[PDB]
């Protein structure tokens, strides 16, 4: 790897600089290099890894959606033929997106998840695994679509089982996991009722635990709770 010669601490320092500069591709390459040093990641480092790749794939997902919409319009009745270019370029963006998802899933499999024993790290990584299979599912169309969806579901479910046993209902990782599993149900698995039920139960159980929290933890938890509420308002 091109980062093999750089110190772990230098990679982390540069990842933070890249974040400040909004250079998320650089940030992701630095954090990939840090992961490949083979040591477990701290909480802050796990968050840097996620921020970097979420922003990279986020740009690709937004582009893919624009191109897919153009492609779908080109396939309506009355639309003039324009040749293979729209499909080709959508496929180019899609392949690059898939490559990023595969890179992240590779890092989680070699060897972040197997070395993660504490609930906060293990749930974070399993959530990430569900998320990047979900992003793969958003563009999947062929024989592997069902297996991609089930890989996302399985990762989220393992994370949910751990989070319910080991974390308080207000924990931001537990909340963000439930939020994203609910989005998976609604947008990927054609299960809007499950999505709504999960969002509601998650929100209500967090509400009843807010009284235990400091001012700062309250702000962290309520920020994610508002996203659950926003989704429920959209879906109901």
């Amino acid at each position: 790897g091109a980062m093999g010669s750089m110190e772990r601490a230098s990679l982390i320092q540069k990842a933070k600089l890249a974040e400040q500069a909004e250079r998320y591709e650089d940030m992701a390459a630095f954090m990939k290099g840090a992961v490949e040093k083979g040591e477990e990641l701290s909480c802050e480092e796990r968050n840097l890894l996620s921020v970097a790749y979420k922003n990279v794939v986020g740009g690709q997902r937004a582009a893919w959606r624009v191109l897919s919409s153009i492609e779908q319009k080109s396939n309506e009745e009355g639309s003039e033929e324009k040749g293979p270019e729209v499909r080709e370029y959508r496929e180019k963006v899609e392949t690059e997106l898939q490559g990023v998802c595969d890179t992240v899933l590779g890092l989680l499999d070699s060897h972040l998840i197997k070395e993660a024993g504490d609930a906060e790290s293990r749930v974070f990584y399993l959530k990430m695994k569900g998320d990047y299979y979900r992003y793969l599912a958003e563009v999947a169309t062929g024989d592997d679509k069902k297996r991609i969806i089930d890989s996302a579901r399985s990762a989220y479910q393992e994370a949910m089982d751990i989070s319910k046993k080991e974390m308080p209902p207000t924990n931001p990782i537990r909340l963000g996991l439930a939020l994203n599993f609910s989005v998976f149900h609604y947008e990927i698995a054609n299960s809007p009722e499950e999505a709504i039920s999960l969002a509601k139960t998650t929100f209500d159980e967090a509400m009843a635990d807010l009284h235990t929290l400091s001012e700062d933890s309250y702000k962290d938890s309520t920020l994610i709770m508002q996203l659950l509420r926003d989704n429920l308002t959209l879906w109901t």
């Binding site: 996620s50 921020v51 990782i173 994610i224």
Partner: peptide
């Protein structure tokens, strides 16, 4: 729909 922020405490 909104998904989670990347950074979670």
């Amino acid at each position: 729909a909104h998904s989670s922020p990347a950074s979670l405490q």
